Amino acid sequence: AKEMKPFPQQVNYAGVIKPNHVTQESLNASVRSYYDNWKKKYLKNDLSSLPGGYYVKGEITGDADGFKPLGTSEGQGYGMIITVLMAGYDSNAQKIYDGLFKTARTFKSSQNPNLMGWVVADSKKAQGHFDSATDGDLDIAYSLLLAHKQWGSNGTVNYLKEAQDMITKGIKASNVTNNNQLNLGDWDSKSSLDTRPSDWMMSHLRAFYEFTGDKTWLTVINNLYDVYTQFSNKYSPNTGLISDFVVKNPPQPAPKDFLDESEYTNAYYYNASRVPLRIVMDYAMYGEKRSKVISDKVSSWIQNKTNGNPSKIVDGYQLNGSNIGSYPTAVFVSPFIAASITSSNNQKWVNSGWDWMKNKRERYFSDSYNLLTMLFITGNWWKPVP
Numbered sequence: 001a002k003e004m005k006p007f008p009q010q011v012n013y014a015g016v017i018k019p020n021h022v023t024q025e026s027l028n029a030s031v032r033s034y035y036d037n038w039k040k041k042y043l044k045n046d047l048s049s050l051p052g053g054y055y056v057k058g059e060i061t062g063d064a065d066g067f068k069p070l071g072t073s074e075g076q077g078y079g080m081i082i083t084v085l086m087a088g089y090d091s092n093a094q095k096i097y098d099g100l101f102k103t104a105r106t107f108k109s110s111q112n113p114n115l116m117g118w119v120v121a122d123s124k125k126a127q128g129h130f131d132s133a134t135d136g137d138l139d140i141a142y143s144l145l146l147a148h149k150q151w152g153s154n155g156t157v158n159y160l161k162e163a164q165d166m167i168t169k170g171i172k173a174s175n176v177t178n179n180n181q182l183n184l185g186d187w188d189s190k191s192s193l194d195t196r197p198s199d200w201m202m203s204h205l206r207a208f209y210e211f212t213g214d215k216t217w218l219t220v221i222n223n224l225y226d227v228y229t230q231f232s233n234k235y236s237p238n239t240g241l242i243s244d245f246v247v248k249n250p251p252q253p254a255p256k257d258f259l260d261e262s263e264y265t266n267a268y269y270y271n272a273s274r275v276p277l278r279i280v281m282d283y284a285m286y287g288e289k290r291s292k293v294i295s296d297k298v299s300s301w302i303q304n305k306t307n308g309n310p311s312k313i314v315d316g317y318q319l320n321g322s323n324i325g326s327y328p329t330a331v332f333v334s335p336f337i338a339a340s341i342t343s344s345n346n347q348k349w350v351n352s353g354w355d356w357m358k359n360k361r362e363r364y365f366s367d368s369y370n371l372l373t374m375l376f377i378t379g380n381w382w383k384p385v386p
Contacts, residue, residue, distance in 0.1 A: 005150050006088025007032075009382040013284040015292070016341045018379060019354035027378040030358045031371075035086050038371050042364055043079065044070070045099060047122045050106055054079070054099035055120045058364050065129065067121035073132065076104055076116065077139025078368040084146040085375050085382075097147060098157055104140050111186040114170030116140060118185070131187040134175045134199045141166040142204040145211055149384040160211070167208050172216060179249060180216075180223040184259075193249055197242045198274040200224045202282035202291065210386050221282075225290045227251050228279075232294075236319040240297030243319065244271035253319065264324055268317045270365075273332045276339035277373050283342055284376075285383050292342045299340040303349055310337065310349075310356040330360050330370035338373050350377075 008028040012018075019027065045054045047070075056075035063069075080100045087093035109115040109132040116137060117130030144163035147153075153160040174186035182199045183192040202221055209217035231251040232240055244265045245254035258265035265271075276298055283291035305321060306312035313333045315325030325332070337353030340346040354377070357370055375381040 073136025
């Protein structure tokens, strides 16, 4: 209730196109329907160890330190952003959001208490047991800025204060490196040169700057763009892609089996699949020219690669464009479509992409990122400003 940015905000960012073969009402309806299905299948609030707490159900996975992972901070972040944006439509949005925040702070990191431990498990012993993952905290911290602009911070939860504390005492202190990059988590070194490009949430960092006044965030943004370009000009001159993990300075693709995450950590795989959306949002929301350049390169490449057919996109590519994957999944498809919105000559491709993703349901990872992408390309992911 009392939303100041009620769904649908359906904004028109400068220099960007939306699917135009259907009405905005149709776009909004697709998002509402997708959200209801996503919530029904993934939004949970059954933690015996934390009544009233909410989390997002992830994929079935192996035990972690004797605990059974039910969700992660990554999913917590996606869920928190989605929830604030759907406020105005979902009458219980704020209750759900505060419940997600309760979980985020209860399951605080064992390293930096201002961050969230990466694993949500139903046990009191798991609360404060795990260390952090940079992307989860970035989305969580950013969601608090959205919450502040959505409901204000005068109620039960001081969203703005919580955001500033998490951003400054948490992310800046533990994840911003001395080389002005972002490390992998609060367990990683302050001078670490190991980074995950999907963590380069440019538009989030812009907001961090505006709501804190800390120039550190602008320094990081500018450096990450330099790193992207130096990396791509050497390792992906024809595709404009980046690898799941990046190492060293100058930047290079991480080796295969990096931290044993997967055998494709040196290529454009499941982690990096998210990058196109994170980057393009900076051009749309803040007019960053470097974002449009990076986005157009990737967009043009994937369009030629698939001959304009979104269903021909596969789940994984080598940096030179050769295939790793075999089928179309939303965490790959949707960001490629989002990266194409800065050039009006991509209208047909954007429309086809919308048709492909609008009702695409598969699993936690693709569905969650698909909903975020859909919220953004329909103009329903508004910009939080002081």
